[PDB]
Amino acid sequence: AWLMLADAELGDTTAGEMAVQRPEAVARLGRVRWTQQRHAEAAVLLQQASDAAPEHPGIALWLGHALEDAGQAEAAAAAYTRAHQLLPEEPYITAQLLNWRRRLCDWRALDVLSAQVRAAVAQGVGAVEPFAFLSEDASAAEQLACARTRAQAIAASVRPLAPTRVRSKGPLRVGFVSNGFGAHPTGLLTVALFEALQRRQPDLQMHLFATSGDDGSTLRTRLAQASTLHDVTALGHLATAKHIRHHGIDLLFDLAGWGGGGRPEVFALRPAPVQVNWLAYPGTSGAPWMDYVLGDAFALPPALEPFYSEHVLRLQGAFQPSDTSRVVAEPPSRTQCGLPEQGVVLCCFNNSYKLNPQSMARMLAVLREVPDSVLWLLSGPGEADARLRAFAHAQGVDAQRLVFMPKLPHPQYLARYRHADLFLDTHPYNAHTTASDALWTGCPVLTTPGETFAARVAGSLNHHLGLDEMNVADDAAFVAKAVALASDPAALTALHARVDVLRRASGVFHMDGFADDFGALLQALARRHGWLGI
Ligand SMILES: O=c1ccn([C@@H]2O[C@H](COP(=O)(O)OP(=O)(O)O)[C@@H](O)[C@H]2O)c(=O)[nH]1
Numbered sequence: 001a002w003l004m005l006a007d008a009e010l011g012d013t014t015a016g017e018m019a020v021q022r023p024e025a026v027a028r029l030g031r032v033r034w035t036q037q038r039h040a041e042a043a044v045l046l047q048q049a050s051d052a053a054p055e056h057p058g059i060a061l062w063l064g065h066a067l068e069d070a071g072q073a074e075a076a077a078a079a080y081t082r083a084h085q086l087l088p089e090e091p092y093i094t095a096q097l098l099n100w101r102r103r104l105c106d107w108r109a110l111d112v113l114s115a116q117v118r119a120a121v122a123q124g125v126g127a128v129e130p131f132a133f134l135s136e137d138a139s140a141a142e143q144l145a146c147a148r149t150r151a152q153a154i155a156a157s158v159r160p161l162a163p164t165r166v167r168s169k170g171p172l173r174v175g176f177v178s179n180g181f182g183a184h185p186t187g188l189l190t191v192a193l194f195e196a197l198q199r200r201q202p203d204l205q206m207h208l209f210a211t212s213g214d215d216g217s218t219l220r221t222r223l224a225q226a227s228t229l230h231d232v233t234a235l236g237h238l239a240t241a242k243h244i245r246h247h248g249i250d251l252l253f254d255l256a257g258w259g260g261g262g263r264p265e266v267f268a269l270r271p272a273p274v275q276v277n278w279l280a281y282p283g284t285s286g287a288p289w290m291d292y293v294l295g296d297a298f299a300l301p302p303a304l305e306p307f308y309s310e311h312v313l314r315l316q317g318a319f320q321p322s323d324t325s326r327v328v329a330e331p332p333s334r335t336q337c338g339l340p341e342q343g344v345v346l347c348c349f350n351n352s353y354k355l356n357p358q359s360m361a362r363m364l365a366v367l368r369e370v371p372d373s374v375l376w377l378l379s380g381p382g383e384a385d386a387r388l389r390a391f392a393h394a395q396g397v398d399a400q401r402l403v404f405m406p407k408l409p410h411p412q413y414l415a416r417y418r419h420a421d422l423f424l425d426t427h428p429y430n431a432h433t434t435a436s437d438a439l440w441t442g443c444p445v446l447t448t449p450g451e452t453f454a455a456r457v458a459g460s461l462n463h464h465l466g467l468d469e470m471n472v473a474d475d476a477a478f479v480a481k482a483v484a485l486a487s488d489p490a491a492l493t494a495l496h497a498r499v500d501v502l503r504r505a506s507g508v509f510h511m512d513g514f515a516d517d518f519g520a521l522l523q524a525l526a527r528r529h530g531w532l533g534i
Pocket residue numbers: 184185188349350351378406407408409410413430431432433434435437
C-alpha cells in the first residue's frame with residue numbers, strides 16, 4: 001500500500017525508510033540499508049525476505065547484491081544463480097550471474113551464459129557491463145556495440161555544459177580523472193610519468209582529478225606532489241564537471257573508463273573541449289563525448305581502428321607507462337612462499353576472471369608435459385582456488401602442483417617474481433599492469449596476441465621490448481614454447497639474461513623519453529584544436 005512511496009525516494013534516503021515503515025517490505029527495508037552502505041544488515045533483512053519467498057527473483061537478486069557487498073561471495077553466488085532460475089530470460093540477471101561465476105572460476109554452463117550475454121549485447125538489451133564483457137570471447141565488433149549502448153543511454157540522460165575551446169594562449173592544462181590514484185593500477189602506472197613530466201615539461205600544467213580519498217600510500221603522495229591533485233571525491237557528477245570546467249582544462253583524460261566507479265556522467269557533461277580515452281579501460285569507450293583514444297602501433301593496429309568510436313592516437317613506443325622507480329626487493333625463500341625448492345616455477349598472477357577454461361587448460365598442458373614444474377597463481381575469491389585445483393585434477397595434473405599466493409602489498413608481491421621462471425599470460429583478457437610488473441622484474445611473459453586491444457597488451461610490451469619470440473600464434477604454440485623453455489634451463493637462463501638487456505636498451509621503461517613523446521603528442525593535439533603556444 002504505502003510502499004510505492006518509498007521506492008520513488010531512491011530517485012530521500014531516510015524519507016524512503018520512513019515510508020517502508022509498515023513481506024516485500026522486509027525486502028525494501030533491506031534494500032534501503034544496502035543503499036546506506038550498511039551491507040551487513042541489508043543482507044540479514046533480504047536473507048529473511050528471501051526465505052519468506054524462496055521463489056521471488058526480485059528479492060533473490062537484491063539479496064545477492066547485499067551478500068556480495070557484504071563480502072560473502074560464495075553465498076552471493078547462489079543468490080544470483082537462483083534469480084536466474086526464476087527468470088531465465090532476463091539478460092540483466094544473466095549478465096551479473098555470469099560475471100560473478102567467472103570471478104569465482106565456476107564454469108558451470110559457462111558457454112551457455114556467455115552466449116546469452118553476447119546475444120543480449122547484440123539485441124542491445126540486458127545492459128551488460130562493458131568492463132565485464134572484456135572477459136568474454138567476443139570480437140572487437142561486439143565490444144564496440146556493448147560500449148555504445150551504455151554510452152548512448154548515459155548520453156540521453158545528460159545535458160552537456162556550455163561549449164568551450166582549447167586556450168590558444170598556453171600553458172596547456174591537462175586533466176586526468178581516476179579513482180585509482182595510489183595503490184591501484186592507474187596510479188601505479190602513471191606516477192613515474194607525472195614525475196618525469198613535471199621535471200621535463202614544466203610548460204605543461206598537470207591536473208589530477210581524484211575521485212577517491214587519500215589511502216595513505218606512497219603513490220598517492222607522490223602523485224599529489226608531482227601535479228596539482230584535486231580531491232573531488234565528495235562532488236556529484238555535475239559539480240565535478242563544473243569543477244574541471246572551472247580550472248579551464250583543455251585536454252582531459254579518462255583514467256577510469258567503464259568500470260571502477262568511473263563517474264561516466266562527468267565526461268558526458270563535456271567539461272573540456274578535448275577528451276581522451278587512455279590507459280584505464282582496455283577497449284573503445286564507444287561514447288559520443290570521447291574524442292580520442294591513445295594506443296600504440298601494436299596493441300591498436302590499423303586493422304582495429306574501425307572498432308574504436310574515437311579517433312585513434314598513438315605514441316611512438318608502447319602505450320603503457322610504468323613506475324620505473326620501483327626497487328624489487330628479495331622475496332622469502334621458495335619454501336616460505338609455499339614453492340618446492342626444486343623445479344621450474346611457471347606463474348600467472350592475473351585476476352581470477354581472466355582465468356577462463358581456455359587459459360587454464362593451456363597452463364595445465366605445460367605442467368602435464370613438463371615434470372617437476374608448478375603453477376603459481378594469485379589466490380582467488382570464494383572457493384575459486386578449490387574449483388581450480390579440481391579442474392587441474394580433472395585435466396590430468398596433481399592438484400598439489402598449483403600454488404596459490406594471497407594478495408600482498410605491491411612491494412612484497414613484486415618481489416615474488418624473482419622466484420618465477422616464466423609468466424604465462426591469459427586470453428582474451430591479458431595481464432596489463434600485471435604484465436609490466438613481471439617484465440620490470442625481469443620475468444619473461446609468454447602471450448598469444450589476439451584480435452582485440454585487451455588481448456594484445458602483453459604482446460605490445462613484448463614487441464616494444466624486443467621479445468617477439470614470446471608472442472606466439474596460438475595455444476599449441478603457446479604450450480610448445482613454454483615446454484621448450486621449461487625443459488631447457490640453459491634456455492630459460494638465457495631468456496632471463498636477454499630480458500635484462502632489452503629492459504635497459506628498450507624505450508619501454510624509459511619514462512623520460514615517454515614524458516617527451518607524450519608531451520609532444522599533447523602539444524600537437526592542442527595545436528590541432530586552436531592552441532598557438534606560449
Ligand atoms: O598480490 C598482488 C597482486 C596484484 N597486485 C596489483 O594488483 C593490481 C592488479 O590489477 P588488475 O589485475 O585489475 O590490473 P591489470 O592486470 O588488468 O592491469 C596491479 O596493480 C598489481 O600490481 C598487487 O599489488 N599485489
